[PDB]
């Protein structure tokens, strides 16, 4: 009842009841909880990775994956906290049976969340990092906050070299802006919008998609813990998405910028009514094409403040950025430190797999552990007319394909359902009609469908094309709930096929489940 330890620190009466923990603290004390838990400040005030919770607040669920930096919790004078066990976490845990990578990512104890004490936890291969922060970061955030409180909805543009802290900083900034409650009698929470323009390792969307998200609650979880927010009191909702079909925006810069314009446009419309700050995080390019892109982005958006997380970056990139910034005649440009294993590739892959296992519908988002193979696929028709077919055709990005090959190439990959809003989209393509072959929409140029008239409606994994009968059909499985799928008349719905990085995890998944619980699997060569 006085637990003291290097990483964490002192405490007081620790009352275990029904599976939850009621812990009292009479003095400033820091904890480092690990796992899945819920916080509900009973009395006093606590800070969690940028947010501040007081007695008048709802339960906040926190996911602390052993991968990233465990959020630190700091409690202030005369406080009583109640730590609840998260329910939906159980489903996520079971995902370890479908991929060993998801196994070592939480506490290997009994309960759902385990406290730590310098080393009494953190099983083998600990590598247990911790979320820290230079005083500079905090000071700058404070400045931005106070300035905001006396002006309209600011726009903060965050950029910098790879592995610099752009994401983490964004996280802190967002939470602070939302939760601040400086002194205007809590005004409970100011909504906040996040514009994600990073196809590489996205936040609030599966890899390969750009999007605009609206947050009502603090963001206290990694990307692979909510990669598919509900489409359409609604803690996090997605306003619009666009498919780039590549893990590198260096395949069609024009398209990338066009997407940025459309999304920002929507933000403008929404902002016009209620004041809502926008936080945008850019990719991680600082030379060549990328640098040019950044310059253009700054010009288009006209960000109020540009934050470069380097402080020792190459003179070339810094100079270029400063010039672009100067051009819009008035934009503050500041620099911050950086503070510099799970490689980006694996992390990205995890995001994708998590997305596909998202259940079609508390607190967050439930998960379904049943392997993809077992699930029943969606049977789409490929023989009729553009009113009794379902899919209007298949378009290819950045690369064509001979007719015959298409069947084999498409099969097994990830594609995107794109909904046509205005017919002024396919204006310039030989759209197949009544019509056995796949209704391929020839696209000589190669440019992707315009972003002004088309919107992404989630990704699709194809599990088998069988066009050898008198009923051509496609078996595809997606996370999109049936409600949305049925409401589309089939006449406005095309499938986009690009890169996406072949979902290799899918094939193996079945085998893992079968073996763990304890035969010509295409594309998998078993070594024996």
């Amino acid at each position: 009842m006085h637990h003291s330890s290097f990483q964490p620190n002192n405490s007081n009466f620790q009352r275990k009841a029904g599976g939850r923990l009621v812990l009292s603290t009479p003095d400033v004390e820091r904890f480092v909880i690990l796992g899945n838990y819920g916080v509900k400040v009973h009395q006093g005030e606590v800070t969690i990775a940028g947010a501040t919770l007081t007695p008048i607040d709802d339960v906040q669920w926190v996911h602390a994956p052993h991968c990233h930096a465990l959020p630190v919790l700091r409690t202030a004078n005369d406080t009583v906290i109640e730590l609840l066990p998260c329910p939906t976490a159980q489903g996520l845990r079971e995902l370890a049976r479908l991929n060993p990578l998801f196994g070592r990512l939480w506490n290997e104890t009994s309960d759902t969340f385990q406290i730590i004490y310098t080393s009494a936890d953190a099983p083998k291969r600990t590598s247990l990092r911790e979320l820290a922060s230079h005083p500079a970061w905090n000071k700058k955030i404070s400045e931005l906050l106070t300035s905001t409180r006396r002006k309209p909805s600011p726009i903060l543009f965050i950029c910098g070299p790879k592995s610099s802290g752009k994401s983490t900083f964004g996280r802190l900034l967002t939470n602070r802006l939302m939760t601040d409650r400086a002194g205007h009698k809590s005004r409970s929470w100011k909504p906040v919008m996040v514009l994600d323009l990073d196809p590489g390792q996205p936040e609030f969307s599966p890899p390969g998609v750009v999007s605009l998200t609206k947050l009502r609650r603090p963001n206290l979880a990694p990307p692979f813990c909510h990669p598919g927010l509900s489409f359409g009191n609604e803690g996090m909702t997605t306003v619009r998405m666009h498919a780039i079909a590549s893990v590198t925006p260096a395949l069609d810069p024009a398209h990338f910028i066009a997407c940025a314009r459309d999304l920002f446009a929507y933000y403008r419309r929404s902002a016009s009514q209620e004041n809502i700050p926008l936080v945008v995080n850019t990719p991680g390019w600082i030379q060549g094409t990328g640098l040019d892109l950044l310059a253009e982005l700054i010009a288009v958006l006209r960000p109020t403040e540009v934050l470069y997380m380097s402080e020792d970056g190459p003179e070339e990139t810094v100079s270029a950025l400063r010039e672009a910034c100067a051009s819009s005649s008035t934009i503050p440009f500041t620099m911050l430190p950086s503070q510099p294993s799970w490689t980006p590739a694996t992390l990205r892959s995890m995001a994708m797999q998590s997305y596909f296992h998202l259940s079609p519908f508390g607190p967050g988002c439930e998960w379904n552990p049943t392997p993809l193979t077992h699930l029943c696929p969606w049977r789409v028709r490929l023989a009729g007319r553009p009113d009794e077919r379902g899919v209007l055709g298949i378009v290819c990005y950045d690369h064509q394909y001979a007719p015959e090959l298409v069947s084999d190439a498409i099969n097994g990959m990830v594609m995107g359902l794109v909904r046509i809003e205005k017919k002024e989209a396919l204006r310039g393509l030989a759209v197949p009609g009544d019509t056995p072959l796949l209704p391929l929409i020839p696209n000589p140029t190669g440019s992707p469908l315009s972003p002004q008239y088309t919107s992404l409606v989630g990704l699709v994994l194809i599990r088998g094309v069988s066009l050898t009968a008198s009923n051509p059909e496609l078996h595809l499985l997606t996370p999109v709930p049936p409600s949305v799928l049925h409401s589309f008349r089939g006449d406005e719905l095309v499938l986009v096929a690009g890169k996406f990085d072949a979902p290799t995890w899918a094939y193996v998944e079945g085998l893992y489940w079968k073996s763990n619980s304890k035969d010509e699997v295409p594309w998998v060569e078993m070594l024996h």
Binding site: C376, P482, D501, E520, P522, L527
Partner: protein
């Protein structure tokens, strides 16, 4: 269970088939046309594989070389006018040599080459092609042919012996689990 290697081709038969198409001589007017046709189909197939993701470097190299050779011996208003052919060849060689050297690296170009067993001639040809005055058609032609035979010894020969009804939820009473891809 790290014994899972992923390949772009569905199974093994497909890979062997492609091998056969590329090298009719070892695997074994109208006949010539047939052979040429098959080679073209093989090249296209490999291209698809490349896009799919994950592909042995040797396969890509072989595809490039064969494509160039086919372009060279094409009569009928379309023989590239001589300069294009020389360019295709140069590109193929550059990619091939760069790949081999880059792979088996921890030295100098020639040292690594000797270690692998790659005749220095190829390294020199590559260097020359990149920096100065693309080589003459004759040299490229002969070199390409030799390259193919070498690749055969180094890789291919070891792959085996030589002999609103638009969306309807699938009936939850007729479905049977089966690997992703099979129908």
């Amino acid at each position: 269970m790290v014994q899972y290697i992923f390949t772009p081709w569905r199974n093994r038969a497909e890979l062997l088939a492609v091998r056969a198409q590329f090298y009719p001589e070892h695997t074994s007017f109208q006949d010539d046309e047939h052979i040429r046709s098959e080679k073209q189909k093989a090249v296209a197939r490999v291209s698809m594989w490349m896009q799919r993701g994950g592909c042995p470097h040797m396969v890509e190299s072989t595809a490039l070389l064969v494509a160039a050779i086919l372009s060279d011996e094409a009569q009928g208003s379309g023989a590239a006018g001589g300069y294009a052919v020389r360019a295709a060849y140069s590109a193929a060689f550059s990619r091939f040599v760069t790949g081999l050297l880059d792979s088996h690296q921890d030295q100098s170009m020639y040292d690594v080459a000797k270690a692998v067993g790659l005749p220095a001639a190829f390294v020199e040809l590559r260097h020359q092609a990149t920096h100065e005055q693309l080589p003459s058609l004759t040299r490229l032609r002969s070199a390409a042919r030799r390259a193919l035979e070498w690749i055969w010894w180094y890789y291919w020969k070891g792959l085996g012996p030589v002999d609103q009804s638009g969306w309807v939820l699938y009936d939850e009473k007729e479905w049977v689990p089966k690997p992703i891809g099979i129908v």
